[PDB]
Nucleic acid binder design. Structure first.
Lengths: 103, 355
RNA sequence: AGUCUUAAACACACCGCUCGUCACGUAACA
RNA sequence: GCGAGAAGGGAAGUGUGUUUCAAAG
RNA sequence: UAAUACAGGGUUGAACUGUGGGUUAGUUUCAAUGCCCAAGGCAGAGCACUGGAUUGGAUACCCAGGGAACUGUGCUCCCAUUAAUAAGAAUC
RNA sequence: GAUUAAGCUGCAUUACGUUUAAACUUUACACUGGAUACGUUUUAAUGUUAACUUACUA
RNA sequence: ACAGUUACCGUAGCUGUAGAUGAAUGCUAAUUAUAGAGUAUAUCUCCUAUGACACUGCAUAACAUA
RNA sequence: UUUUAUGAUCCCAGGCUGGUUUAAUAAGUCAAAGUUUAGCCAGAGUCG
RNA sequence: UCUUUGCCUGGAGGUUCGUACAGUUGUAGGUAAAAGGUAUGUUAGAGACU
RNA sequence: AGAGGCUUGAUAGUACUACCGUAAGUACAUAAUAUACAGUCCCAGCAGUAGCGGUUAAACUAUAGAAGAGUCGAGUAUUAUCCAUACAUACCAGGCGUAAAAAGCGUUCAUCCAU
RNA sequence: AGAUCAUCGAAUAUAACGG
RNA sequence: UUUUUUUUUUUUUUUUUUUUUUUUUUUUUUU
RNA sequence: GGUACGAAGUCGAAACAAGGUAGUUGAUGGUGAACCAGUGGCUGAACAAAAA
C-alpha cells in the first residue's frame, strides 16, 4: 500500500505508466509451447521502493491461449486478460505476435 | 537501464553494429583532407622572434630614474597613546604597528592542560586557543603555549593576529549556497537566514559569530569530535569552511551573465558610458559641429533642462498660497517662527522652571 | 663512570608489570 | 400488516484490504 | 634447475575477425603441515621412553641411545589461507 | 396420558489472580421503525459523576 | 542540541539534557455553580433473571351527518 | 507431464485503511520508507 | 568520478544409512574501558666511545 | 506566604508560528546571601559514566540553619512504554592498512552493468 | 474485471505425477 | 679417533636473472 | 566436568627486554600449576654480517 503523498512523486508515476497498458495488456516471451493450443508467456513487471528510491524487476510467468498456434518458443507476444476462467491453466488470449524466431 | 532479456531482443537496430565504419571527426582525418586539396602546402612551424632592440633601446630610460648619485652610489659603493585610557602600551613587540589594535576583539575558546615527564617528577604547562579577528571582514585563529593560564592566553592571541586572512563575503549580507565542512568526524553546516532576521546560534559561541562578520546565518556544530577532546580538530574546520564562500562579484565576473539580487536593479553590471556622453564641449568648437552633425528633429525628452546646480536654501513647506485653508495658514505661521528662533529653540535646559 | 643509538605490554616508571593449580563463599544457563 | 445480528473478532497469507476501470433486471 | 619426449603461458611480424565483454550458485578442479588406511625398509635426522647431572630447592635448556612421523593418481582444507590491505573503467 | 421434553456467542451478583480493569439521571435536541397526519413511540442517542496527566479564564 | 570520561592525537562505546504522555505509584490541595476527545477498555470459577407480557397500526369495516 | 533460490513442498502467531493545525530561508503545494481517536469494506450454516 | 560480488557492529560467555545425515555469531550471571599511534621520561646480564 | 512538591558539588544555553535594537513595574521607598554554622568520622550514607566520606570538604542528617538563595504552581515528582534527541536505524547520512570488517587461487548458470 | 515487495520465531529442502 | 685408496646403497636448489632507473608511477589529514 | 562475580591464603616465576637461553599458530604426544618436545607456515625477528 502507498500513502497519499507517495502517489504524486515522479518515481511512482513513471513506474505506473510502464506497467499500465491499454486493456490491461502485457508484454512477454513464450517459454513453453508443448501442450496443444497452449503457450506460457513470461511477462516482466516493475515496482517502486520509497525507502532507497530504486526500481527492480521481477518475472511473472502466465499461461495464454492461441487459436492458430502461430507463436513458438522464444517469441515475444502480446496478451490480453479475460473476465472468466477457461481450462485448468489457460487464463489469457493472444492478439498478435511481434517477433518470430527462425524455426 | 534494465538490460533484461526482453530488452536485449528489441533494442538491436541491426544484426551487426559496424563501429569501425562510423564517421567520427578525428585529428588525422581532417589533416588528410586539407593535404588532398594541394595538387602534386604542408605543415609549418614558426620560431620565437628574438629582437635586441626590444630591451636595448628601453633599458636606458629606466636608468634615468635612478642615475642620481644619492640613490646609486650607496648601493654600488616604543609606546602608543590610547587617549580615552591614557596609559603606555607596547607597540611593536613583534606586532605590526600599522594595524590598529583598538578595532579587534578576542574570544577565549578553551584553556587545555598538558603533562610533561622529567627525571625527577612531572611538569605541567598550560595552553590556550584564542581567535582574533575583525567583525567586518576578517577572521583568525591562533594557538600557543605558556607556563601559566594567564600567560598562555596572551601568547595564543599573538599568533591569531599574525595569521589574519581575508574572507569572500557578499556586500549584501546574503550568502549564495550553504557551505559544509569536515576534518575527521566533524560537520559544521551553516544554514543561511533571511535578511533582517538576525543571527541564531548557540549562546556559548555567540561572540564567535560576530567576530566572523557573517550576518544572517545559522551556525551549528554537528558532533565536532566523537572521540577524545573536541577542541583541536575544530580549529581547522573554520579554515576550510569559509574559503568555499562566493559572492556575486566573483561569480558574475567569470559567469558573464545576469547575477543580480532582488532588491537592487543592475548595480554591478550597469556601466553607463561616462566618458562618451558627458564629454566636455567648449564654445569655441561648438559652432563647427553644428553644420556637420544631424539636425535636431526628435521628440522623446521632456525633462531635458538642467545645468550646474548651486546649493540654495529654500522652504517649500512655508509657502503661503491662495488656495490654502485659513487654518493651515495660521498653523504654518506659528511653526515657522519656532524654527527660526536662535535663543530659545536652539538651547538645552535641564530643569523646567528657570531655576 | 658520563654520553650516543635501538627496543619496550612500565610512566605512584623494575621494590615496575603480570599469569596458572589448589582451598572457602554468593549465583544464571539445571 | 411492516421493521429487528443495530449487544457478532469464531474462519483466512497471498488472503483480507487499497488503487485503476466498468455496470439501461 | 645441462640432454630428450608431450603440451601450456608471455614478447614481436603478417593475415583473418568487426563489440566478441566486467562480476559470478542450487556449480566445478587444485591446494603446505598434521592424522586414518595403504605401500613400505638396509642412508642422513628424532617425539614418547630411567640414561649422568643439577641450582640460591626442585628438572625436558647442555651430550648419547631411541620400533611413530618424511616419496601416495586415495580420503582431505582446520591455520599467521601461498606475490602486499580492491576483481573492473577514467585522469599521466 | 390429548404437544406438557426450558436457562446463551449475550447481561448481572459474588469470589480468585494481577502494578492497574468503570453503575448515578425529570434518562424527551436528533437519527430511525410504524403510519393517512411534525397523528404515536423506543435504554444502542443525549446530559451528569471524575486520581485534571487537556483548551479558555483582573 | 551541547557538555563529561589521565592534565597529547584517529576509532569504538557510555551518563545528563528534547519531543510524543495512548500505565502504575508517593506527597500535598474538594479551593464560584459555564470541566473535554479514543476500542468506553483484559483472563477464569459458583449462583440468579431472560423465552412470550418487546415498538407501531382497529385506516385490523372506526367514535358512522337534521 | 508440472512447480522449483525471482523461494516449489512445509510447522506457529499476527485482518487492511483515513483522520484538517503542526513553528525551523528541514519557511512543503499532500508532513516525505514505516506512529493515531467517533469512520468505510468485510465477517458460513443448522428445529428432521 | 562510475558498475558488480563477499563480510563486521564496545570488550566478553554457555550441562555431566538413526552414537547416522544436514545445520549453528546471537534469547544470560556479569562490566565501563579494551585499543592504533607522535613525542618525553625511565629500565635494559643490548651495540659503540671521550 | 491568597499554596504545596522538587534542586541547594561541577557539567547542560535554558525554544522555535505575530513582532525581530525603532523600547519603562524608568526613579524614590529598597537592598541582601548559604563554598557562615550544627551532628557522625572507611562507620552510618548519597549519587548520573566519571565520584565524595580518616586530619571535618558548599557531595551524608538537619532550615526557630533567618521573613531560604532558585525553577514550576493548584499540582509536582519517580518508574515504565516507542522509529529512545546525528549513540544517524547509515539512499539523503557510517566501513573493509595498523584498530571489529575483502572468500587461498581460477573457468562457468541467473540478475545488474557497458560504447 | 485487471494490477498490487511479505515479516518474526537461529537453522536443518528437493517434492508430487507416467514407463 | 687421523691419513690414504679403486667401481656398494639412499638423497638432489652450492654456482647461474638485481644499483627497483617512466612525470619516480602511487598507501592512509592530525600528535 | 566447565564458566561469572567478591574476598583472599599456599605452591611456582610463564609473558615484557636475546636471561624461561625467539614465540604465536594448524594437527598430535606428554606433564599437579607457567605449559614442554618434534614438523609446516608467519614476523607480531633479536644478535652478527663482502671490494681486485
Amino acid at each position: 500500500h502507498y500513502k497519499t503523498w507517495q502517489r504524486n512523486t515522479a518515481g511512482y508515476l513513471r513506474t505506473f505508466m510502464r506497467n499500465k497498458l491499454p486493456n490491461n495488456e502485457m508484454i512477454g516471451y513464450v517459454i513453453n509451447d508443448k501442450h496443444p493450443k497452449s503457450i506460457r508467456v513470461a511477462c516482466d513487471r516493475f515496482m517502486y521502493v520509497m525507502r532507497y528510491k530504486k526500481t527492480f524487476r521481477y518475472t511473472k510467468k502466465v499461461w495464454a491461449h492461441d487459436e492458430e498456434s502461430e507463436a513458438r518458443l522464444g517469441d515475444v507476444v502480446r496478451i490480453q486478460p479475460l473476465g472468466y476462467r477457461i481450462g485448468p491453466w489457460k487464463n489469457y488470449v493472444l492478439v498478435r505476435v511481434l517477433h518470430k524466431e527462425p524455426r | 537501464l534494465h538490460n533484461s532479456h526482453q530488452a536485449r531482443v528489441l533494442r538491436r537496430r541491426h544484426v551487426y553494429r559496424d563501429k569501425h565504419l562510423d564517421h567520427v571527426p578525428t585529428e588525422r582525418a581532417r589533416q588528410l583532407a586539407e593535404q588532398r586539396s594541394a595538387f602534386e602546402p604542408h605543415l609549418r612551424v614558426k620560431l620565437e622572434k628574438e629582437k635586441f632592440l626590444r630591451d636595448c633601446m628601453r633599458e636606458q630610460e629606466n636608468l634615468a630614474a635612478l642615475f642620481t648619485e644619492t640613490e646609486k652610489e650607496t648601493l654600488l659603493g616604543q609606546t602608543v597613546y590610547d587617549a580615552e585610557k591614557g596609559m603606555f602600551v607596547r607597540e611593536r613587540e613583534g606586532v605590526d604597528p600599522l594595524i590598529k589594535l583598538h578595532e579587534l576583539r578576542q574570544t577565549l575558546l578553551s584553556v587545555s592542560r598538558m603533562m610533561s615527564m622529567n627525571k625527577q617528577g612531572r611538569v605541567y604547562y598550560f595552553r590556550a586557543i584564542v581567535a582574533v579577528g575583525n567583525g567586518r571582514g576578517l577572521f583568525g585563529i591562533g594557538i600557543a603555549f605558556g607556563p601559566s593560564p594567564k600567560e598562555a592566553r596572551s601568547n595564543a592571541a599573538l599568533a591569531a593576529i599574525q595569521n589574519l586572512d581575508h574572507i569572500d563575503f557578499d556586500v549584501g549580507r546574503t550568502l549564495t549556497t550553504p557551505v559544509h565542512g569536515s576534518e575527521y568526524s566533524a560537520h559544521v553546516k551553516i544554514v543561511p537566514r533571511p535578511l533582517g532576521k538576525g543571527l541564531k546560534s548557540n549562546l556559548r559561541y555567540l561572540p564567535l559569530l560576530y567576530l566572523m562578520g557573517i550576518d544572517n546565518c545559522r551556525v551549528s556544530f554537528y558532533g565536532p569530535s566523537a572521540s577524545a577532546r573536541w577542541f583541536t580538530r575544530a580549529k581547522a574546520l573554520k579554515r576550510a569552511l569559509e574559503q568555499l564562500q562566493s559572492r556575486r562579484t566573483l561569480a558574475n565576473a567569470t559567469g558573464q551573465k545576469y547575477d543580480l539580487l532582488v532588491a537592487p536593479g543592475e548595480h554591478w553590471m550597469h556601466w553607463p558610458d561616462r566618458w562618451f556622453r558627458p564629454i566636455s564641449t567648449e564654445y569655441a568648437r561648438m559652432l563647427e559641429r553644428i553644420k556637420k552633425k544631424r539636425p535636431p528633429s526628435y521628440r522623446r525628452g521632456f525633462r531635458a533642462a538642467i545645468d550646474e546646480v548651486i546649493p540654495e536654501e529654500i522652504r517649500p513647506e512655508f509657502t503661503p498660497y491662495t488656495w490654502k485653508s485659513p487654518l493651515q495658514k495660521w498653523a504654518e505661521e506659528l511653526k515657522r517662527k519656532r524654527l527660526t528662533s536662535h535663543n530659545v529653540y536652539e538651547t538645552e535646559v535641564f530643569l523646567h522652571p528657570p531655576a
